[PDB]
Design an enzyme around this catalytic site. Sequence first.
Site, mmCIF file in Angstrom:
data_model
loop_
_atom_site.group_PDB
_atom_site.id
_atom_site.type_symbol
_atom_site.label_atom_id
_atom_site.label_comp_id
_atom_site.label_asym_id
_atom_site.label_seq_id
_atom_site.Cartn_x
_atom_site.Cartn_y
_atom_site.Cartn_z
ATOM 1 N N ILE A 24 0.826 -1.182 0.000
ATOM 2 C CA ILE A 24 0.000 0.000 0.000
ATOM 3 C C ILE A 24 0.874 1.251 0.000
ATOM 4 O O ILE A 24 0.547 2.194 -0.691
ATOM 5 C CB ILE A 24 -0.976 0.020 1.185
ATOM 6 C CG1 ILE A 24 -1.852 -1.228 1.257
ATOM 7 C CG2 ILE A 24 -1.811 1.290 1.133
ATOM 8 C CD1 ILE A 24 -2.742 -1.253 2.480
ATOM 9 N N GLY A 25 1.935 1.297 0.799
ATOM 10 C CA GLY A 25 2.751 2.536 0.896
ATOM 11 C C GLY A 25 3.839 2.422 1.957
ATOM 12 O O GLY A 25 3.986 1.373 2.601
ATOM 13 N N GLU A 26 4.603 3.485 2.151
ATOM 14 C CA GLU A 26 5.780 3.460 3.043
ATOM 15 C C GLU A 26 5.894 4.758 3.840
ATOM 16 O O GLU A 26 5.507 5.816 3.366
ATOM 17 C CB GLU A 26 7.075 3.402 2.248
ATOM 18 C CG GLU A 26 7.445 2.028 1.772
ATOM 19 C CD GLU A 26 8.642 2.070 0.845
ATOM 20 O OE1 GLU A 26 8.964 1.042 0.235
ATOM 21 O OE2 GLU A 26 9.250 3.141 0.748
ATOM 22 N N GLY A 30 9.026 2.064 7.927
ATOM 23 C CA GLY A 30 7.762 1.350 7.957
ATOM 24 C C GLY A 30 7.211 1.113 6.553
ATOM 25 O O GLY A 30 7.340 1.921 5.682
ATOM 26 N N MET A 31 6.648 -0.046 6.324
ATOM 27 C CA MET A 31 6.019 -0.352 5.058
ATOM 28 C C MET A 31 4.635 -0.926 5.355
ATOM 29 O O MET A 31 4.484 -1.756 6.223
ATOM 30 C CB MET A 31 6.835 -1.354 4.239
ATOM 31 C CG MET A 31 6.113 -1.790 2.980
ATOM 32 S SD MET A 31 7.164 -2.785 1.876
ATOM 33 C CE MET A 31 8.404 -1.576 1.440
ATOM 34 N N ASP A 142 1.150 15.468 14.628
ATOM 35 C CA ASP A 142 1.499 15.326 13.202
ATOM 36 C C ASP A 142 0.208 15.144 12.378
ATOM 37 O O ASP A 142 0.181 14.360 11.399
ATOM 38 C CB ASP A 142 2.548 14.232 12.992
ATOM 39 C CG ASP A 142 3.252 14.267 11.638
ATOM 40 O OD1 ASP A 142 3.353 15.359 11.007
ATOM 41 O OD2 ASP A 142 3.674 13.204 11.198
HETATM 42 C C1 LIG Z 1 -2.228 5.694 9.361
HETATM 43 C C2 LIG Z 1 -0.887 6.075 9.074
HETATM 44 C C3 LIG Z 1 -0.324 5.120 8.072
HETATM 45 O O1 LIG Z 1 0.116 4.021 8.391
HETATM 46 N N1 LIG Z 1 -0.535 5.508 6.801
HETATM 47 C C4 LIG Z 1 -0.268 4.760 5.643
HETATM 48 C C5 LIG Z 1 0.660 5.214 4.718
HETATM 49 C C6 LIG Z 1 0.897 4.490 3.567
HETATM 50 C C7 LIG Z 1 0.206 3.319 3.323
HETATM 51 C C8 LIG Z 1 -0.720 2.847 4.236
HETATM 52 C C9 LIG Z 1 -0.946 3.549 5.416
HETATM 53 N N2 LIG Z 1 -1.725 2.991 6.441
HETATM 54 C C10 LIG Z 1 -2.941 2.392 6.343
HETATM 55 N N3 LIG Z 1 -3.571 2.426 5.154
HETATM 56 C C11 LIG Z 1 -4.815 1.926 5.100
HETATM 57 N N4 LIG Z 1 -5.477 2.086 3.918
HETATM 58 C C12 LIG Z 1 -5.045 2.714 2.722
HETATM 59 C C13 LIG Z 1 -4.284 3.874 2.816
HETATM 60 C C14 LIG Z 1 -3.771 4.468 1.680
HETATM 61 C C15 LIG Z 1 -4.028 3.932 0.414
HETATM 62 N N5 LIG Z 1 -3.413 4.462 -0.723
HETATM 63 C C16 LIG Z 1 -2.025 4.066 -0.968
HETATM 64 C C17 LIG Z 1 -1.255 5.199 -1.617
HETATM 65 N N6 LIG Z 1 -1.217 6.376 -0.747
HETATM 66 C C18 LIG Z 1 -0.368 6.130 0.438
HETATM 67 C C19 LIG Z 1 -2.578 6.749 -0.346
HETATM 68 C C20 LIG Z 1 -3.622 5.877 -1.041
HETATM 69 C C21 LIG Z 1 -4.839 2.798 0.323
HETATM 70 C C22 LIG Z 1 -5.333 2.190 1.466
HETATM 71 N N7 LIG Z 1 -5.480 1.340 6.106
HETATM 72 C C23 LIG Z 1 -4.835 1.304 7.291
HETATM 73 C C24 LIG Z 1 -3.562 1.822 7.465
HETATM 74 CL CL1 LIG Z 1 -2.829 1.837 9.055
#
Ligand SMILES: *CCC(=O)Nc1ccccc1Nc1nc(Nc2ccc(N3CCN(C)CC3)cc2)ncc1Cl
Length: 350
Positions: A24-26, A30-31, A142
């Site tokens: 999903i992202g980084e 953390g990933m 933050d």
């Molecule tokens: C909550 C802080 C954190 O961990 N944020 C974060 C950052 C990157 C990837 C995931 C993520 N945490 C979580 N994501 C989801 N759902 C979710 C978030 C973001 C997306 N997309 C990926 C690309 N971009 C980063 C934004 C859009 C998709 C799904 N659910 C729970 C957590 Cl903890």
Amino acid sequence: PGEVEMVKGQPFDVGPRYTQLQYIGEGAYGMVSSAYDHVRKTRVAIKKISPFEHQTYCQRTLREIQILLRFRHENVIGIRDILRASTLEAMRDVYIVQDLMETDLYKLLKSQQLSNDHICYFLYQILRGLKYIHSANVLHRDLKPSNLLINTTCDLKICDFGLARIADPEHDHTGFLTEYVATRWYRAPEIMLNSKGYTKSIDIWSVGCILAEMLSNRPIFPGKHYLDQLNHILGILGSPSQEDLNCIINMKARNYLQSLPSKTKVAWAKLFPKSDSKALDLLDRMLTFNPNKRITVEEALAHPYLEQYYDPTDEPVAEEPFTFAMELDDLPKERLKELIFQETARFQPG
Ligand SMILES: *CCC(=O)Nc1ccccc1Nc1nc(Nc2ccc(N3CCN(C)CC3)cc2)ncc1Cl
Ligand SMILES: C=CC(=O)Nc1ccccc1Nc1nc(Nc2ccc(N3CCN(C)CC3)cc2)ncc1Cl
């Protein structure tokens, strides 16, 4: 079968309960991946944290874990499960399992203009969440769009508590241009002048910046470097009043402020000509220069802009405030590691 699934060349060893991992992202150490939970039969988010080589990363991991295990609120992300090795020496990383959300506000504001309805209701959920957080004397520190998760039914949850701390008004003072960790664009003016960000007013400011961003689809104060951030803020708020200057006695901060050419506050209605005037009034009160005159989260929820959603019987608060001693921040990382081992014990074994 029974393999270790890779995500972007990084092993995500969360089998056998969790499989079919997708990136999903980084963040910095953390990933985050989505995964299928074979026990609950649903997809979840799993964050891999590998913090144990750096004391500061260890501080942040423990802080987020201790807070989120103890919080339970609709507008704050929960912890569902934590995976880590059975022994301390084998423990090289930690996996935090959370509800999978659809998107974040950052993504949403890049892709679409929001209706007033959506802006209002996102703001309400942010403040509802923040009321619960502040009721435990916790500061998030933050808040920004990428730390606000949103699902397909417009439910919003605050996340990433790694820089959270306890409100500590007696030790908020620091010098001019003191280094700060939180994302530059959402830093209140006093962070750059005389404040460590140890009172609840710094989260209100960030919420103000988020509202501005929801109204216009761009950051209101996008400073290119530390001092530029202050300059962006003063460019819109104008020359501080004499009363507001007299609350600043750091000599370098005052002389910097007093060196700037005179400028009157820019009317919010001129920067946001097509925004609801009630929303601009709330924005005005959140983005006040003087932290002591900034609206509180309770007062913001009661503001006329949020009147369709405001319901103090459905805006819960935490059981009890929390405490974290300054001395935590001086613990060697081996000791932080043992506390993370302890805090995660209740989820053993697999
Ligand atoms: C909550 C802080 C954190 O961990 N944020 C974060 C950052 C990157 C990837 C995931 C993520 N945490 C979580 N994501 C989801 N759902 C979710 C978030 C973001 C997306 N997309 C990926 C690309 N971009 C980063 C934004 C859009 C998709 C799904 N659910 C729970 C957590 Cl903890
Ligand atoms: C609340 C303050 C504010 O924003 N007022 C203002 C008013 C006009 C222009 C800029 C600014 N402020 C800034 N200006 C500077 N530096 C600068 C220094 C001098 C000058 N003069 C030189 C000669 N003087 C007669 C006019 C211009 C210009 C800019 N740095 C950061 C900022 Cl934020």
